């Protein structure tokens, strides 16, 4: 079929078909353009007119312009020949290395795995990060979420996980940049290459990349995650492999939708969001999942507007995760990186039956004391510390040292911390905290515990500080 | 051209024309009325219809009524014969003294002076008010703004300034009462007569008065500023005169705009204000300015709704001033007048290369100590001063003495302070504040500093307090 | 002991007063956020 453009208002384009109305979700191509412009059908307005979202700029479009129904939703090159490559929302290479010669093509829109397809294996996935591991362990094949307001560490944390995990991972990895910084896709691509995760000469590439950055129109941003996720589902089902999925930042998918929502003629829900936020998020989040066929280990960065965790978006996403790392500008502000909030981070495997009681009693032991100290903070603030029971001024001590022992110099932030990155093993972590909690270092100074890897470095640093 | 009234809603009158549709901004005269009713065209709705804003109450109008294109925008008598006269939005005298017989007439809608026409001379304007002079000094030909929630001191401060500055000013003055109290216009007029700035006998008046008060329909309040403004522009450019322009209150012009905006059929912006708030403030604020031809020192009172300075109206006004005097209810309630917030008032002249470093260092000195006192306040609040450091308690002493020394009796507020108004010379201010800072009066009691002019009077008060 | 008694009487009474004020400030704020958030929804809906 051939339709005509009847109205253009931003990323929203209305098309009128004379015969044969393209179904909802169908992709249409605008005729007469130097570059490929795809319009996704969004609604049937009636009168053989469809309302659509543009996958790119709408400049220069004209009323009356021709549009052909492609007869199917956006379909992209899926398969192993996507590895080491950089793709578009619409599946076009954007790395200047030629076509992507895949055997098959997949539509980015698809139903989520059925209930009888779910898996319930729960294996801790050690990362080398003290805080995460100790208190909110990630799980292989589980859904992980890094929550944070602007500039608190979401991406760097995603960066050190790619290093401490993606790099040894025997399986593919798909990194989908959704509405983030272009500078960043260029930093990562070239880093993947310099470290051979991406190989431009041979077929040893172990990571496919998909990008729809912040310089794109809402439409592209409302779909890249789909493209990204679609690439990943292939390796899960058609190959049955262990996939690692990185998305930075999934909030962008939801902001994308809120940006065209009004032009779609909808009464706004609260906080400006579109009324279909949760369902829009649901049909998507439900595909990002491990099944009996394959396994996905998704690490999704989640932006928090105005730093408010109750904002309908961040708020609506918690339910889709098995582990959550909540970052806080209040912690970051103190120079404690990674700025994870020890009392607002959780993992579904923080179970004695899964990580063990030593792991579990330490974690909870560390959390009680930080909570105990949080409560006193506001009070010794004013009433001072003298009146406090030696019993209580020891927890202030230990807490302040733990607070530090939880920071760590990342290997991807030496440009930031001026410190060599340290990766600590799960047992070095459990033990280090166990001892602080045990009173075994009440003599060393707090500062000795700040920006160090394993507990021995805290002891060494004490001496170095000893003068 | 003759059009017909098609619709009437409050101050928004829609008129249809058959031949010859008047351009936007043109003033139309409604036909068949005991008094003049000017309609200002606002937009072409198409279908030969124009949507307009009435300049007076619209009661009595009838659909189908005849309207006549005046052929131009509201035009008003401009020249020296407006001096000593009180006039309307539409320029008619309202002082029962006859017609204002002028050679020329000016239209209230003009474009703002061009970039190349701008000036950059920065001269300090001393007012005799301690806080203002020391911390946020005004400037000749500059733009000053006094921000204040209800009943905080905006008008009293304008009056005291009229007294301290306007009274001995060689050159003219224009007072534009926008959306304020009628009694105030009356209080001022008669006072102006009395001190002789308005002379009903000779041609020696130095003030022209324009008013569109709290009792007018929205459209009048929405345009009187433009009207006072135009009068001032004449003296500036047509006589290269150094003008003084007082407006009470410019917030009312914006409010007026918000009143008609729904009627014009516009989707509201934040807080129910009109989406055209900034541009409306802009093309208006940009004519209130000094140029190469003439100087306009303008003092504008800015009413802050619910005391919220984040309100679109006041919020959008900061960017147009060179100096701002932000009044505070909290301070006023402490009994400090003028209730100026010392850490919130500013002035583009607070530059060492303009006020001198002596001035620049006392100024920043005072603010630093008050800022320091300000952070201690939270703790002082639950636990008082006991737990304070000897050092911290000295900032507190000094801060509370600096805070009191910033207050001062105005002639204009004598009936309320119970004290004789004082005018302190700049060097007296720079000085008195130095010493306080410098610990030369750590022995005097706070109360000695409250409500006085020069420091010398603060020492005395201390003796009297014994 | 008479000065600590006095100082702690005051401190405690200041606290309570502070408590009473923050609480009232809390409710004013709580009511305005709801009202504010609701007018925002209505404005968007009416514009359509």
């Amino acid at each position: 079929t051939t339709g005509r453009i009847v109205a253009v208002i931003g990323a929203v384009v209305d098309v009128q078909f004379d015969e044969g109305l393209p179904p909802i979700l169908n992709a249409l191509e605008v005729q007469g353009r130097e570059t490929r412009l795809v319009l996704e059908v969004a609604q049937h307005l009636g009168e053989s007119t469809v309302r659509t979202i543009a996958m790119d700029g709408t400049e220069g479009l004209v009323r009356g312009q021709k549009v052909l129904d492609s007869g199917a939703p956006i379909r992209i090159p899926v398969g192993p020949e996507t590895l080491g490559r950089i793709m578009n929302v619409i599946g076009e290479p954007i790395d200047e290395r030629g076509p992507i010669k895949t055997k098959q093509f997949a539509a980015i829109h698809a139903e989520a795995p059925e209930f009888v397809e779910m898996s319930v294996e729960q294996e801790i996935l050690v990362t080398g990060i003290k805080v995460v591991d100790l208190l909110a362990p990630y799980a292989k094949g589980g859904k992980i979420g890094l929550f944070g307001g602007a500039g608190v560490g979401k991406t760097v944390l995603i960066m050190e996980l790619i290093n401490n995990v993606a790099k040894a991972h025997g399986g593919y990895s798909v990194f989908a940049g959704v509405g983030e910084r272009t500078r960043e896709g260029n930093d990562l691509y070239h880093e993947m290459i310099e470290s051979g995760v991406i190989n431009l000469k041979d077929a040893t590439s172990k990571v496919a990349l998909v990008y729809g950055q912040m310089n794109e129109p809402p439409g592209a941003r409302a779909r890249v995650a789909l493209t990204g996720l679609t690439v990943a589902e292939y390796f899960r089902d058609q190959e049955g492999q262990d996939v690692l999925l990185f998305i930075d930042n999934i909030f962008r998918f939801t902001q994308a939708g809120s940006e065209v929502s009004a032009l779609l003629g909808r009464i706004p829900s609260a906080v400006g969001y579109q009324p279909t936020l949760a369902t829009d998020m649901g049909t998507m989040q439900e595909r990002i999942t491990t099944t009996k066929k394959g396994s996905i280990t998704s690490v999704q960065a989640i932006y928090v507007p105005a730093d408010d965790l109750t904002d309908p978006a961040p708020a609506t996403t918690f339910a889709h995760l098995d582990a959550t790392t909540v970052l806080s500008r209040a912690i970051a502000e103190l120079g404690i990186y990674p700025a994870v909030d020890p009392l607002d981070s959780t993992s579904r495997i923080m179970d004695p039956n899964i990580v063990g009681s030593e792991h579990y009693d330490v974690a909870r032991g560390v959390q009680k004391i930080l909570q105990d100290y949080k409560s006193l903070q506001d009070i010794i603030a004013i009433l001072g510390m003298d009146e406090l029971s030696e019993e209580d001024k020891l927890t202030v001590s230990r807490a302040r040292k733990i607070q530090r022992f939880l920071s760590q110099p990342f290997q991807v932030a030496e440009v930031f911390t001026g410190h060599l990155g340290k990766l600590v093993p799960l047992k070095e972590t459990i033990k280090g905290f166990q001892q602080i909690l045990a009173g075994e270092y009440d003599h060393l100074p707090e500062q000795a515990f700040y920006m160090v890897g394993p507990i021995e470095e805290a002891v060494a640093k004490a001496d170095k500080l000893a003068e | 051209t003759t059009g017909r009234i098609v619709a009437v809603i409050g101050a928004v009158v829609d008129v249809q024309f058959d031949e010859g549709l008047p351009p936007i901004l043109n003033a139309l005269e409604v036909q068949g009325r005991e008094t003049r009713l000017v309609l200002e065209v606002a937009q072409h709705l198409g279908e030969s219809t124009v949507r307009t804003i009435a300049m007076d109450g619209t009661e009595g109008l009838v659909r189908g009524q005849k309207v006549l294109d005046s052929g131009a925008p509201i035009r008003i008598p401009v020249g020296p014969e407006t001096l000593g006269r009180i006039m309307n939005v539409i320029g008619e005298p309202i002082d029962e003294r006859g017609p204002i017989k002028t050679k020329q007439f000016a239209a209230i809608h003009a474009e703002a002076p061009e970039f190349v026409e701008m000036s950059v001379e920065q001269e300090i304007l001393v007012t005799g008010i301690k806080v203002v002079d020391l911390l946020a000094p005004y400037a000749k030909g500059g733009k000053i703004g006094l921000f204040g929630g209800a009943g905080v001191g905006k008008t009293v401060l304008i009056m005291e300034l009229i007294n301290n500055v306007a009274k001995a000013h060689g050159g003219y003055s224009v007072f534009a009462g926008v959306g304020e109290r009628t009694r105030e216009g009356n209080d001022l007029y008669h006072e102006m007569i009395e001190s002789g700035v308005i002379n009903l006998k000779d041609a020696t008046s130095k003030v022209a008065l324009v008013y569109g008060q709290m009792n007018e329909p929205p459209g009048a309040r929405a345009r009187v500023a433009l009207t006072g403004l135009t009068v001032a522009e004449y003296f500036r450019d047509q006589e290269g005169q150094d003008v003084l322009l007082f407006i009470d209150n410019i917030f009312r012009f914006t409010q007026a705009g918000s009143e008609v905006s729904a009627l014009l059929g516009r989707i509201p912006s934040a807080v129910g204000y009109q989406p055209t708030l900034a541009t409306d403030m802009g093309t208006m604020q940009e004519r209130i300015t000094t140029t190469k031809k003439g100087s306009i020192t303008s003092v504008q009172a800015i009413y802050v709704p619910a005391d919220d300075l984040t309100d679109p109206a006041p919020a959008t006004t900061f960017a147009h001033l060179d100096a701002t005097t932000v009044l505070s209810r909290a301070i006023a309630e402490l009994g400090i007048y003028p209730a100026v917030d010392p850490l919130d008032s500013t002035s583009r002249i607070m530059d060492p290369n303009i006020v001198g470093s002596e001035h620049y260092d006392v100024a920043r000195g005072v603010q630093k100590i008050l800022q320091d006192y300000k952070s201690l306040q939270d703790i002082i609040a639950i636990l008082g001063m006991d737990e304070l450091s000897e050092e911290d308690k000295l900032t507190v002493s000094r801060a509370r003495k600096i805070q009191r020394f910033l207050s001062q009796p105005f002639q204009v507020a004598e009936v309320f302070t119970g004290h004789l108004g004082k005018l302190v010379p700049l060097k007296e201010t720079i000085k008195g504040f130095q010493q306080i800072l410098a610990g030369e009066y750590d022995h005097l009691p706070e109360q000695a500093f409250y409500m006085v002019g020069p420091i010398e009077e603060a020492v005395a008060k201390a003796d009297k307090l014994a | 002991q008479s000065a600590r008694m006095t100082a702690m009487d005051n401190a405690s009474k200041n606290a309570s007063e502070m408590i009473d004020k923050l609480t009232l400030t809390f409710n004013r704020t709580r009511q305005a956020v709801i009202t504010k958030e609701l007018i925002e929804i209505i404005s968007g809906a009416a514009a359509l």
Binding site: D386, E387 | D386, E387, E390 | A3, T6, A7
Partner: peptide, 12 residues
């Protein structure tokens, strides 16, 4: 501490 100016007085 927390007894007003008991100590500061003697110290002074």
């Amino acid at each position: 501490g927390l007894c007003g100016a008991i100590h500061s007085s003697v110290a002074k």
